[PDB]
Amino acid sequence: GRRRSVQWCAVSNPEATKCFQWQRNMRKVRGPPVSCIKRDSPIQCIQAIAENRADAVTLDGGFIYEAGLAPYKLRPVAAEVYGTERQPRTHYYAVAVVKKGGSFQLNELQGLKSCHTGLRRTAGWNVPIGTLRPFLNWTGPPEPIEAAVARFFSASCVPGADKGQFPNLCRLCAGTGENKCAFSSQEPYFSYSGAFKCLKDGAGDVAFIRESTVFEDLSDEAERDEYELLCPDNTRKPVDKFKDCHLARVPSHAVVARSVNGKEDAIWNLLRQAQEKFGKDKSPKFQLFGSPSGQKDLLFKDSAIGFSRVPPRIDSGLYLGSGYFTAIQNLRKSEEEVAARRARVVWCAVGEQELRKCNQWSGLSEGSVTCSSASTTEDCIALVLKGEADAMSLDGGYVYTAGKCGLVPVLAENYKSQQSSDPDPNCVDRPVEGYLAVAVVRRSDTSLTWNSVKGKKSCHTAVDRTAGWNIPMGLLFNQTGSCKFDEYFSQSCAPGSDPRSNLCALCIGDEEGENKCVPNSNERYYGYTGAFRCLAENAGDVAFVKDVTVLQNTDGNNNEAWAKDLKLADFALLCLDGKRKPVTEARSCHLAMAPNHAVVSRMDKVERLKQVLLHQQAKFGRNGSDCPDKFCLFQSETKNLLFNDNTECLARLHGKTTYEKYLGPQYVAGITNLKKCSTSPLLEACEFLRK
Ligand SMILES: [Cl-]
Numbered sequence: 001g002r003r004r005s006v007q008w009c010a011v012s013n014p015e016a017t018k019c020f021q022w023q024r025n026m027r028k029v030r031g032p033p034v035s036c037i038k039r040d041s042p043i044q045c046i047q048a049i050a051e052n053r054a055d056a057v058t059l060d061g062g063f064i065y066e067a068g069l070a071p072y073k074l075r076p077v078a079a080e081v082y083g084t085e086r087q088p089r090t091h092y093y094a095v096a097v098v099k100k101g102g103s104f105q106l107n108e109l110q111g112l113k114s115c116h117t118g119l120r121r122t123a124g125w126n127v128p129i130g131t132l133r134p135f136l137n138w139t140g141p142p143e144p145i146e147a148a149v150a151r152f153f154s155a156s157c158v159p160g161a162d163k164g165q166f167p168n169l170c171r172l173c174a175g176t177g178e179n180k181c182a183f184s185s186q187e188p189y190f191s192y193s194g195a196f197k198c199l200k201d202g203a204g205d206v207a208f209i210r211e212s213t214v215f216e217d218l219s220d221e222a223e224r225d226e227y228e229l230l231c232p233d234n235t236r237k238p239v240d241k242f243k244d245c246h247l248a249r250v251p252s253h254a255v256v257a258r259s260v261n262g263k264e265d266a267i268w269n270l271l272r273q274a275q276e277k278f279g280k281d282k283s284p285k286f287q288l289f290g291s292p293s294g295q296k297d298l299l300f301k302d303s304a305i306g307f308s309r310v311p312p313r314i315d316s317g318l319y320l321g322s323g324y325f326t327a328i329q330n331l332r333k334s335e336e337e338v339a340a341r342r343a344r345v346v347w348c349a350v351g352e353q354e355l356r357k358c359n360q361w362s363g364l365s366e367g368s369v370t371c372s373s374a375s376t377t378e379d380c381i382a383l384v385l386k387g388e389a390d391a392m393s394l395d396g397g398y399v400y401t402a403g404k405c406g407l408v409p410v411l412a413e414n415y416k417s418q419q420s421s422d423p424d425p426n427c428v429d430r431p432v433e434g435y436l437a438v439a440v441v442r443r444s445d446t447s448l449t450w451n452s453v454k455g456k457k458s459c460h461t462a463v464d465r466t467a468g469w470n471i472p473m474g475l476l477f478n479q480t481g482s483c484k485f486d487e488y489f490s491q492s493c494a495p496g497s498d499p500r501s502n503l504c505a506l507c508i509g510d511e512e513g514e515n516k517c518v519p520n521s522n523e524r525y526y527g528y529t530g531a532f533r534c535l536a537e538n539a540g541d542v543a544f545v546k547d548v549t550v551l552q553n554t555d556g557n558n559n560e561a562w563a564k565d566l567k568l569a570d571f572a573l574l575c576l577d578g579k580r581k582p583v584t585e586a587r588s589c590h591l592a593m594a595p596n597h598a599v600v601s602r603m604d605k606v607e608r609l610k611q612v613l614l615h616q617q618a619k620f621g622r623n624g625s626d627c628p629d630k631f632c633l634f635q636s637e638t639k640n641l642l643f644n645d646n647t648e649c650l651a652r653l654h655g656k657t658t659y660e661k662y663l664g665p666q667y668v669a670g671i672t673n674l675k676k677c678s679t680s681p682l683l684e685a686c687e688f689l690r691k
Pocket of ligand 1: 395461462465466467468469528545
């Protein structure tokens with residue numbers, strides 16, 4: 001087809017010129033080839049790549065956005081590294097700095113005084129104003145946004161604004177005469193530093209800058225404690241907490257490619273080489289990162305020092321992050337659409353059986369709950385990081401991952417405090433207590449014990465789940481030191497594993513044989529119920545489930561014909577000490593305690609989200625007005641759709657509102673250790689966006 005050439009896209013003749021000098025110097029080293037094509041602008045180049053006339057182009061965050069849309073749908077494949085090696089920066093945070101001691105929170109900037117870096121800049125305007133669109137009263141595109149922010153702050157310094165159309169935006173500007181409010185250095189309250197000094201001097205109440213500013217311009221480490229940042233969950237925290245209190249992380253420029261047949265391989269080969277040899281301080285004959293005397297950042301930024309391969313799970317939407325992604329969409333969207341969308345709760349359903357239930361739920365929510373879906377739990381997480389979905393209930397194993405991703409716990413799934421017991425009218429404030437992970441076996445083989453389970457057949461709820469995987473595989477690991485999970489057992493049914501492995505050997509997919517090993521309801525051997533079924537159907541010898549699982553699938557508690565005649569007495573539990581115990585004794589024969597499933601979300605959605613659930617609960621929870629009349633939120637019965645079936649109510653966290661706190665330190669430490677052997681596409685992705 002098309003030569004082992006990567007075809008680079010240029011936006012200027014100058015750029016085209018550097019390209020050609022690239023092409024020739026790559027030929028001279030018998031390095032990977034690069035062709036060059038020239039267009040007049042970034043979109044022309046986005047168009048080119050998408051119509052197959054070019055392969056890559058490096059873009060800034062606003063173009064990464066445009067490029068990810070239809071009809072282009074390109075993707076970031078390599079990121080520019082700035083700084084110095086050892087001081088490598090892949091991004092910065094867009095923060096709202098205010099001085100110590102106020103009671104105003106982001107929700108309340110109304111009527112205050114603002115200091116911005118400059119009209120249409122990322123951190124001084126796009127992010128902040130996009131973030132605040134909800135409050136502006138601003139009809140929309142067009143009426144000029146400027147008209148509404150001028151009506152929201154009582155005064156700002158917005159360099160570059162029209163002091164003739166919006167005098168207010170320039171009133172705190174410190175420039176003399178006509179310089180006043182200039183998008184230049186002639187204006188002292190211009191860019192990061194002018195905007196911060198604007199605060200510093202007492203002219204404005206809030207400065208919208210980048211995190212580094214605060215650091216690089218504050219001398220001691222003492223008048224730095226005189227400062228504070230505003231968080232999107234309407235809190236305030238100190239300036240070194242920017243990794244947890246920021247309006248947006250703005251990513252470094254990235255080399256974008258086609259999401260389908262993008263030559264990403266080719267592209268990274270080219271780049272890695274381009275870099276070893278024509279790097280920074282690498283050769284006098286050519287410099288990838290360098291521009292000819294009256295030119296700036298041709299092809300790459302002249303300040304870049306290298307590139308970072310962006311994990312394949314990243315999207316333009318994941319690349320920008322929710323803060324930045326939603327800021328850009330808000331500034332485009334009608335006011336009614338913004339309205340609607342902050343009111344609605346978009347649930348993320350994993351699988352079609354879960355979407356059926358959601359839909360049903362959505363129907364009766366009196367408009368407050370809507371549904372989105374994905375095929376996997378990581379995919380739902382990624383839809384909430386993109387702001388496309390808002391919540392879902394997750395196992396603690398995925399609470400860690402969504403937490404590494406910046407998501408937070410909101411409410412926990414409360415279970416009844418022990419095997420047989422009564423309803424607590426105060427379920428919502430009762431502290432969560434966890435649940436027990438067990439290893440259940442069929443009573444027939446007498447010789448099977450915890451000490452001989454190695455080498456047999458296992459049934460797991462899914463990979464990365466607590467009772468189904470982390471605990472059993474963590475235990476075994478402790479014992480053997482081996483990271484070779486697929487050699488612990490002969491054959492297994494472990495949804496979410498490699499379809500070609502022994503780990504997926506016992507899965508049976510759906511009625512037709514498809515969806516084998518997918519980690520959703522379509523796999524009949526998926527979850528608590530499916531891993532139990534895997535044991536009961538004698539596909540595997542041990543099932544890693546919770547103690548309640550046996551109870552809900554035996555003695556007729558489960559209707560399904562495979563389950564119908566099962567008897568509790570037909571199962572035993574494998575205790576850590578080698579004994580076998582009846583199922584009613586999980587209290588003294590369990591593998592470990594696992595944290596309750598938790599509803600997670602984005603900080604920007606937490607108060608709206610509790611409010612809709614508390615309220616949805618009241619109508620459809622365990623003792624609720626319309627349950628079972630119309631719909632029961634916590635019933636599917638042995639189905640476990642959206643929520644576990646033994647959920648009494650959704651309950652408060654008791655300040656345990658960070659994945660770290662909610663799971664607690666021994667849980668964290670254990671999983672951390674395990675992720676060493678292997679990770680996941682999304683943990684990977686999130687580790688990269690946070691590095
Ligand atoms: Cl599980």
